[PDB]
Design an enzyme around this catalytic site. Structure first.
Site: not given
Ligand code: CDL
Ligand code: 3PE
Lengths: 167, 86, 114, 458, 141, 74, 90, 110, 57
Positions: B41-42
């Site tokens: 994700d990040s």
């Protein structure tokens, strides 16, 4: 602003305010995964206060020590020489009144001027017809259908389609 | 005073693919869509342009995240911002 | 120092059904952009947020006004207030300045102007 | 005036006598020709004095002030034609004739030879001004403002008649200012307060104090076609000068009660300019500039002893030319955007480049850049009231501070961009728009070479 | 020329939900923190029911602002709250007040006690006895 | 035109990049190091020196200082 | 995001399409039109400085004898003694 | 003094155009990245600003700090003037150590 | 643009014009020749000093 991208808008600046603090180039780069290591602690868990304590204690040690006059990327909302190109500023469509012998210059640009206006002067039978239909009553943001289902003309025509170039 | 063309923006975006050691020179050229091997994700959404944050890096606002999934959609509106090709 | 200015707070889930306040401003912007784009306008739009900004500031303060308070009778500490004080100064000069000018001298021989 | 009134009445059966649309060119042609004749016999010499002809003129000897009164009828007709040309010719002939009929009485005023000839001509106005206020304005609050323009000017001026007729049968006769050689002094009493006070208060109602200025942002805010009597109403305010004719003599020794007129008009000066920086109506922005550095003369007349009359005369026609043009800058740039809201006119300075100089050289006369007619006026007032008390440099210095931040706030609101709107505003400031904006600075900086013409006796 | 809801009236409790918005959309359904109740301090003629004041404030700084015009340049439709102090006033800083600026000049306020002395180069101190004696001693010889 | 063709830098010097060796007890590991080492290597180890830079090497430090002195001198 | 896949590919067919029209120099479209039509250092330099010095001297020599104060020159600041006098010093 | 900064603004004015804008003491690099002439002009005036070993304003700077030698001053004035001279030295090497010393770090297309 | 006489780079160190370095090295020599009158001849303080005037009796 969703909780998914709540850390992300803080994640872009967490490294961005860091590089204004270094002096070398590798000093930032040796600290790269080192700054990522604290950010990689809580990887995959819930979305409640179980994981909001990543953020609820990120006020300290980010706002505490936040960018003592950082780098500003000079073409930006802030920073020097951002909106500076304004003595020219491109006053588009100031060409209405001339009293010619001043319309002598650019005979082809004035030739091409009257050509493009047909899309501007005649699009209201088509674009405004579906505009009462596609917008149901008062809904959110007013972009049209992105091809407008046959030919997007535009809806943003022509002030966003022929807008001011920078120099 | 220096001009620019559109053959340089196709290379620099493609080069920093090869400069990253996470990504091999075996992925697709213009559209691997980031999710092909993008993770997680990040750090696969903002870190993917953190190299161009130093190189091009004209402050790259909050809208630039989810448009950047399509790796050709990055190349689309950089030409719109900095007064580029014809 | 003027001010705090409260740049981060909490949410989720204090009154989560608060949304579509954007539906007000999207309605206005769909009203505005349809108004702003047209092939023959030649003139400004009214936009009565300005009209209600001047006319509720220029007029509509005295038809509003009632002297029911003493914070509008506060003006005697502000209107006639300092004007009392400037009289107190200026008659102490031109009197203490006057007696020294008559009884005794202070200026020199080369004071033709004045 | 031998015959200056006699040609300028002959202008009046020329307008209706004319043809169709020629009525604009026929009036402005001949009206400029008086400006030679106005200069012609006047400006003579000069050492005690020029009594002129008879009981009708003392020639306005030591205070010229009258050449400026004769520019304006060939200055307003070129200004008024912007939005007037939709009415009938039968009313277009009217609005030129009453405007000449306002110049007729001002010509026998300022000279006037007397003090009772002054008053009946001091009040012979206010009838042709009121016709220009009520008819020919814009939307309402004309009619109450038509009544606020009365009932201050007329309530004060009636106790002149009680006092001027009182002098005429007390000490000889007032009929001449040169039979004012025999003057008995006026001591401290309880009736001689009111003789001083009633004779003075009717002049305060036109050149305002901080109190009773309540009619001044009423008539100027809601105002005719393009400043058309607003140029006249700024002369008429400084045409209440006659305190210079009265109070120099005729109760000369009452400074005992000057102090409630000093402190009210010296502290009001520092506040009534400060109360304008948050204005949102553009024509009301200028209307408070006209309050402030007009009220500097009221502390310059009551303080006697010249080096002030050097400056108090030069300030009457300092903003006679400045505040006229600022109204003309705002009577223009309203024909194109139909609001006087100062917010709305942004995106400018790119669209109309030639009039950028007309903004600045207006607003550079309030900053006042010492070789003009302005800081030769203030710096005699400053060096005068310094010698009253030393402490007055403070308030008058902060007067110089705030009006610097005040004048630029009207300039700098046009230096922005992107204009957001406005398919209109095309007209690139035509030949008339620069002509009537000229002839203001062209005499204003010219007279700075030899300004001995602008001086009292003194 | 709009006469219906031209401006406010003598409020601010004249059925506040009817005001914002009949027009003047300060509140959505009179619970928006900008319902026209805010007559803060009745008895002053300033700010009646008034789709107007004490609303959140301190500064439309015209930053990124990417919806459209949004802020101060580009003119959104109905967002004027109080102005003419806000085209030149901004946001919050780093730290807080800790007024060290008066403390910065306090260093010379302590050195105003060094204004009492002199700065003679020859000689040094010799501050304990009367041997210093700033001026001369006897006469010729 | 296409001067940064890849497989060119390929860390061999640039002692800044021994800091990635320092984190071997920590481990990140691979991505990425060739960004800051763009122009760290090359002929960019010239890297002007101490007081000899403001001396400019003390190059003409005494050049005509002794060459002028001196004759006549009788 | 699936929505702007259809969007912004026609925007380049509108923005850059106009910007295709925007770069415009066919056959040098400044006409201008009509009409027609180092070493010297001779007439450029002599016209600038040499003429006013003739003028500004003429209002100077004809001026010291008219105004009762000319330039207000100081004294010679002498040590010994000679010049146009005779006096001597040790 | 008038010969100092009209040189020195104009000296650094060639640098701001050279990167086309940064005007930041960060992101600069070293001295000789094809910058032979103006770095030589930088190390003269910034050496004049050190306090004049034998340079231009040595006859203005040294003769005044040694005109405050024997004086009736505040005695906190010489404790404020002469201390400020030491602070003028770190003005010099700061622009050296960020713009004229380090490894070349700035975004590309030199 | 019109003339590419100084080409842009990809960090390959574009060099000088092989004449700028001559004027560059010429004005380090003119200042270190100008250390002549700094030492030869100019001392720290050419004034003379006092030999501690204690015997004044
Ligand atoms: C090829 C061309 C063909 C041939 C051309 C002819 C050859 C050239 C002509 C010869 C020179 C005459 C020119 C006059 C100006 C210079 C005069 C001078 O310096 O000596 C003073 C000289 C004094 O004569 P005097 O014998 O020594 O003493 C008599 C007085 O007692 C003296 O005291 P005073 O009473 O005069 O008081 C002094 C003061 C008093 O005068 C004033 O202050 C009046 C000006 C302000 C009026 C304000 C009232 C308005 C209401 O005068 C001044 O202001 C001097 C400023 C310059 C003249 C002002 C022009 C007025 C406009 O002349 C004058 O003062 C009179 C000036 C009259 C002006 C004539 C108009 C000339 C316009 C020419 C336009 C050319 C345009 C070219 C285009 C350029 C493109 C780049
Ligand atoms: C207020 C009203 C009070 C007025 C009282 C009248 C003053 C008076 O008595 O006049 C004094 C004097 C002549 O009166 P007298 O005493 O008989 O002279 C001696 C004759 N051997 O001398 C005079 O002739 C003075 C006559 C002129 C003064 C009359 C007007 C006084 C009121 C004007 C005040 C200012 C304006 C205020 C009104 C406007 C607002 C409503």
């Amino acid at each position: 602003l969703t909780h998914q991208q709540k850390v992300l808008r803080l994640y872009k600046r967490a490294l961005r305010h860091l590089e204004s603090w270094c002096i070398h180039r590798d000093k930032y780069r040796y600290f790269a995964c080192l700054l990522r290591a604290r950010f990689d602690e809580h990887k995959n868990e819930k979305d409640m206060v179980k994981a909001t304590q990543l953020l609820r204690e990120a006020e300290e040690e980010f706002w505490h020590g936040q960018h003592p006059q950082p780098y500003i990327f000079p073409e930006s909302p802030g920073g020097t020489s951002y909106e500076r190109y304004e003595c020219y500023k491109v006053p588009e469509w100031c060409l209405d009144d001339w009293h010619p012998s001043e319309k002598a210059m650019y005979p082809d640009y004035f030739a091409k001027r009257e050509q493009w206006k047909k899309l501007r002067r005649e699009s209201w039978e088509r674009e405004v017809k579906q505009l009462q239909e596609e917008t149901p009553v008062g809904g959110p943001r007013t972009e049209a259908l992105p091809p407008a289902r046959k030919q997007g003309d535009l809806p943003p025509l022509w002030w966003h389609i022929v807008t001011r170039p920078r120099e | 005073a220096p001009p620019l063309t559109l053959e340089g923006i196709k290379d620099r975006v493609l080069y920093v693919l090869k400069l990253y050691d996470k990504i091999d020179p075996e992925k697709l050229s213009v559209n691997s869509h980031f999710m092909k091997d993008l993770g997680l994700d990040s750090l696969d959404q903002v870190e993917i342009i953190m190299a161009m944050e130093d190189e091009f890096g004209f402050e790259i606002p909050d809208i630039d995240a989810e448009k950047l999934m399509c790796p050709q959609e990055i190349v689309d509106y950089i030409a719109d911002k900095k007064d580029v090709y014809e | 120092t003027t001010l705090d200015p409260a740049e981060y707070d909490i949410s989720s889930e204090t009154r989560k059904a608060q949304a579509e306040r954007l539906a007000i401003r999207s309605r206005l912007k769909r009203e505005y952009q349809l108004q702003y784009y047209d092939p023959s306008r030649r003139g400004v739009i009214e936009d009565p947020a300005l009209v209600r900004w001047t006319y509720a500031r220029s007029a509509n303060i005295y038809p509003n006004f009632r002297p029911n308070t003493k914070t509008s009778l506060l003006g005697a500490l502000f209107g006639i207030g300092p004007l009392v004080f400037w009289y107190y100064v200026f008659k102490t000069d031109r009197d203490r300045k006057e007696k020294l000018i008559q009884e005794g001298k202070l200026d020199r021989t080369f004071n033709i102007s004045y | 005036m031998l015959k200056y009134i006699i040609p300028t009445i002959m202008l009046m059966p020329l307008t209706w006598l004319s043809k169709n649309n020629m009525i604009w060119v026929n009036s402005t042609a001949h009206s400029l020709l008086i400006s030679f004749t106005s200069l012609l016999l006047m400006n003579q010499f000069g050492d005690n004095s020029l009594n002129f002809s008879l009981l009708f003129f003392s020639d306005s000897l030591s205070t010229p002030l009258l050449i400026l009164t004769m520019w304006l009828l060939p200055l307003m007709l070129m200004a008024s034609q912007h939005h007037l040309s939709k009415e009938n010719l039968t009313r277009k002939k009217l609005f030129i004739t009453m405007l000449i009929s306002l110049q007729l009485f001002l010509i026998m005023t300022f000279t006037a030879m007397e003090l009772i000839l002054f008053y009946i001509l001091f009040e012979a106005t206010l009838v042709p001004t009121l016709i220009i206020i009520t008819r020919w304005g814009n939307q309402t609050e004309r009619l109450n403002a038509g009544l606020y323009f009365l009932f201050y000017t007329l309530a004060g001026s009636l106790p002149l008649l009680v006092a001027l007729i009182y002098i005429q049968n007390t000490v000889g006769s007032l009929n001449f200012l040169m039979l004012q050689y025999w003057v008995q002094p006026v001591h401290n009493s309880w009736s001689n307060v009111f003789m001083w006070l009633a004779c003075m208060m009717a002049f305060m109602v036109k050149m305002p104090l901080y109190g009773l200025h309540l009619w001044l942002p009423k008539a100027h805010v809601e105002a005719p076609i393009a400043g058309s009597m607003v140029l006249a109403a700024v002369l008429l305010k400084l045409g209440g000068y006659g305190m210079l004719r009265i109070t120099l003599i005729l109760n000369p020794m009452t400074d005992f009660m000057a102090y409630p007129f000093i402190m009210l008009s010296l502290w009001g000066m520092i506040m009534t300019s400060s109360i304008c920086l948050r204005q949102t109506d553009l024509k009301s922005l200028i209307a408070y500039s006209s309050v402030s550095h007009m009220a500097l003369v009221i502390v310059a007349i009551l303080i006697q002893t010249p080096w002030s009359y050097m400056g108090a005369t030069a300030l009457m026609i300092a903003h006679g030319l400045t505040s006229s043009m600022l109204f003309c800058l705002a009577n223009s740039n309203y024909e194109r955007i139909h609001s006087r809201t100062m917010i709305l006119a942004r995106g400018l300075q790119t669209l109309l480049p030639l009039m950028a100089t007309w903004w600045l050289l207006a607003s550079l006369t309030n900053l006042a850049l010492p070789p003009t007619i302005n800081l030769i006026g203030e710096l005699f007032v400053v060096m005068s009231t310094f010698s009253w008390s030393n402490i007055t440099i403070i308030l008058m210095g902060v007067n110089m501070v705030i009006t610097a931040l005040y004048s630029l706030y009207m300039l700098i609101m046009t230096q922005r961009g992107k204009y957001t709107y406005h398919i209109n505003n095309i007209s690139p400031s035509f030949t008339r728009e620069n002509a009537l904006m000229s002839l203001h600075i062209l005499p204003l900086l010219l007279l700075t070479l030899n300004p001995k013409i602008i001086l009292g006796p003194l | 020329a709009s006469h219906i809801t031209k401006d406010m009236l003598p409020g601010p409790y004249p059925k506040t939900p009817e005001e914002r918005a009949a027009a003047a959309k300060k509140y959505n359904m009179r619970v928006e923190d900008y319902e026209p109740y805010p007559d803060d301090g009745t008895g002053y003629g300033d700010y009646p029911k008034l789709p107007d004041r004490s609303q959140q404030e301190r500064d439309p700084w015209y930053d990124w602002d990417h919806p459209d015009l949004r802020l101060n340049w580009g003119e959104p439709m109905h967002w004027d709250l109080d102005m003419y102090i806000r085209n030149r006033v901004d946001t919050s800083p780093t730290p807080v007040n800790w007024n060290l600026m008066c403390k910065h000049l306090f260093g010379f306020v302590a050195f105003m006690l060094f204004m009492f002395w002199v700065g003679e180069t020859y000689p040094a101190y010799q501050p304990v006895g009367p041997k210093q004696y700033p001026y001369n001693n006897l006469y010729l010889e | 035109m296409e001067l940064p063709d890849y497989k060119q830098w390929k860390i061999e010097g640039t002692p800044l990049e021994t800091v990635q060796e320092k984190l071997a007890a920590r481990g990140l590991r691979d991505p990425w190091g060739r960004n800051e080492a763009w122009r760290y290597m090359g002929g960019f180890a010239n890297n002007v020196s101490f007081v000899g830079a403001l001396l400019k090497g003390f190059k003409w430090g005494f050049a005509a200082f002794v060459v002028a002195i001196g004759a006549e001198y009788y | 995001t699936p929505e702007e896949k259809l969007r912004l590919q026609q925007l380049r067919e509108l923005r850059r399409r106009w910007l295709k029209d925007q770069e415009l120099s066919p056959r040098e479209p400044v006409l201008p039109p009509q009409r027609v039509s180092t070493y010297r250092h001779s007439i450029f330099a002599f016209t600038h400085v040499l003429i006013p010095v003739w003028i500004i001297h003429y209002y100077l020599k004809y001026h010291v004898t008219t105004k009762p104060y000319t330039i207000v020159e100081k004294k010679p600041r002498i040590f010994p003694g000679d010049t146009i006098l005779e006096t001597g010093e040790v | 003094h008038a010969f100092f900064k009209a040189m020195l603004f104009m000296c650094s004015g060639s640098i701001i155009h050279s990167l086309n804008d940064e005007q930041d003491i960060r992101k600069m690099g070293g001295l000789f990245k094809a910058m032979p002439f103006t770095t030589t002009a930088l190390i003269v005036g910034s050496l004049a600003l050190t306090g004049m070993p034998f340079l231009t304003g040595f006859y203005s700077k040294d003769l005044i700090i040694e005109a405050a030698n024997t004086s009736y001053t505040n005695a906190w004035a010489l404790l404020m003037t002469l201390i400020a001279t030491s602070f003028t030295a770190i003005y010099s090497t700061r622009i050296i150590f960020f713009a004229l010393l380090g490894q070349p770090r700035f975004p590309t297309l030199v | 643009g019109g003339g590419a006489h100084i080409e842009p780079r990809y960090r390959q160190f574009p060099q000088l014009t092989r004449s700028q370095v001559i004027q560059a090295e010429f004005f380090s020599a003119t200042m270190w020749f100008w250390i002549l009158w700094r030492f030869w001849h100019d001392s720290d303080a050419v004034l003379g000093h006092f030999p501690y005037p204690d015997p004044s009796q």
